[PDB]
Design an enzyme around this catalytic site. Structure first.
Site, PDB file in Angstrom:
ATOM      1  CD  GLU A  27      42.178  46.197  37.039  1.00  0.00           C
ATOM      2  OE1 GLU A  27      42.640  46.516  35.929  1.00  0.00           O
ATOM      3  OE2 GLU A  27      40.992  46.382  37.375  1.00  0.00           O
ATOM      4  CG  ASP A  28      47.001  42.804  39.643  1.00  0.00           C
ATOM      5  OD1 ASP A  28      47.048  43.862  38.958  1.00  0.00           O
ATOM      6  OD2 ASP A  28      47.382  41.677  39.198  1.00  0.00           O
TER       7      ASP A  28
END
Ligand SMILES: Nc1nc2c(ncn2[C@@H]2O[C@H](COP(=O)(O)OP(=O)(O)OP(=O)(O)O)[C@@H](NP(=O)(O)OP(=O)(O)O)[C@H]2O)c(=O)[nH]1
Ligand SMILES: [Cl-]
Ligand SMILES: [Cl-]
Ligand SMILES: [Cl-]
Ligand SMILES: [Cl-]
Ligand SMILES: [Cl-]
Ligand SMILES: [Mg+2]
Ligand SMILES: [Mn+2]
Length: 351
Positions: A76-77
């Site tokens: 995600e990041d």
């Protein structure tokens, strides 16, 4: 230098060198992906997936699971696609990190609030969607570390997370047989969800805690010596550890509300735990036999050391609990007329 790898590395000795190499590669990949990222604690983000991997290493999870514990946040990041994690760490490591990250969102979406048995249908939702149970274990290890570091969160979030762990993740660790994990999830949830009642119960235990651990240590020191001086048991053993069982604070307070008792009115049964690490056996079948054989060897020495109270032997190795819990238990007369419960199991059995 961060030095996070040097703390994790010792926990990885139960893995083959090739497997530890896959975990170092995973650590560096995570290290790079989360570079410059920070946790609300002010610590660099990598601190979290290293702690999460460390929990899974303590639990002795397979290499893919521990490597996935380091990579469980990268997608995600950090501009990492799932294709990269499959190309670099295989499809099982991707499957697991994709599953731990995906479920986080499903729980946000799911409409069950104030509903009769809502946690039951939400727990089953994870059970149904994640056929590889490793996904759940990684999610449990993640939730545990988050709770361990819950002071760097608003008190609003603190109770939201504690309650959610109490309804969803702690009962899921129970279903999976992960009692060690379950206890900690419960006590940490209890701490933040009901702070006033946690601080009152803890204070009462911290008064007798000087004397209780003083006694428990007499029994621990004695049982340590007895086991170490048994030549045959040590011939089939790689290592062992004798510890005092921690008070399950959530369950202690839970039974006080239900049974309408006081912390003085509830019986403090002292318990000790023998964890046994058998030596590597030449075949897989011989390894399995050694695992059982070594616990019954200990049961006998415990019975030579302390007088066993009749009818208190419990064999969960021969007959595991519905959640697959395996351990041997015996209540004996130790500490000069006191009941002492002894839990005996292998490192593999300790979940
Ligand atoms: N407990 C804890 N959480 C921290 C800390 N620093 C950062 N966090 C993150 O806060 C998050 C709390 O959950 P969240 O409120 O759903 O996350 P968010 O979108 O508000 O996060 P950001 O402000 O963008 O970072 C948590 N996310 P995670 O994916 O691990 O798990 P979830 O609860 O299933 O969603 C943590 O990664 C920290 O010091 N302690
Ligand atoms: Cl590299
Ligand atoms: Cl369930
Ligand atoms: Cl359990
Ligand atoms: Cl346990
Ligand atoms: Cl004694
Ligand atoms: Mg938030
Ligand atoms: Mn996480």
């Amino acid at each position: 230098d961060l030095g996070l790898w040097n703390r994790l590395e010792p926990a990885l000795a139960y893995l083959a060198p090739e497997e530890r190499a896959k975990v170092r590669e995973a650590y560096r990949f995570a290290e790079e992906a989360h570079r410059g990222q920070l946790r609300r604690s002010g610590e660099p983000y990598i601190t979290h997936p290293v702690a999460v991997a460390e929990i899974l290493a303590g639990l002795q999870m397979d290499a893919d699971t521990v490597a996935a514990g380091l990579l469980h946040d990268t997608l995600e990041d950090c501009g990492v696609a799932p294709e990269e994690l499959e190309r670099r760490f295989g499809p099982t490591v991707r499957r697991i990190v994709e599953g731990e990250t995906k479920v986080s969102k499903l729980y946000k979406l799911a409409n069950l609030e104030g509903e009769e048995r809502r946690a039951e249908d939400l727990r089953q939702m994870f059970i149904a969607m994640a056929e590889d149970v490793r996904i759940i274990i990684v999610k449990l290890a993640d939730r545990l570390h988050n709770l361990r570091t819950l002071e760097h969160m608003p008190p609003e979030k603190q109770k939201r997370i504690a309650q959610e762990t109490l309804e969803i993740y702690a009962p899921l660790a129970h279903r999976l047989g992960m009692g060690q994990l379950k206890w900690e999830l419960e006590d940490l949830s209890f701490r933040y969800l009901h702070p006033e009642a946690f601080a009152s119960l803890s204070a009462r235990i911290q008064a007798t805690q000087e004397a209780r651990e003083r006694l428990i240590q007499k029994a621990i020191h004695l049982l340590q010596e007895t086991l170490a001086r048994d030549e045959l048991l040590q011939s089939q053993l790689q290592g062992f550890e004798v510890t005092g069982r921690p008070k399950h604070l959530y369950s202690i307070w839970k039974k006080m509300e239900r049974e309408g008792k006081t912390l003085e009115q509830i019986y403090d049964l002292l318990a000790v735990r023998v964890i046994l690490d058998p030596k590597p056996a030449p075949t897989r079948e011989s390894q399995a036999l050694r695992e059982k054989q070594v616990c019954y060897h200990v049961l006998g020495l415990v019975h030579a050391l302390w007088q066993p109270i009749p009818g208190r032997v419990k064999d969960y190795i021969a007959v595991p609990k519905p959640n697959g819990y395996q351990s041997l238990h015996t209540t004996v007369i130790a500490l000069e007329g006191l009941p002492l419960e002894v839990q005996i199991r292998t490192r593999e059995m300790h979940r």
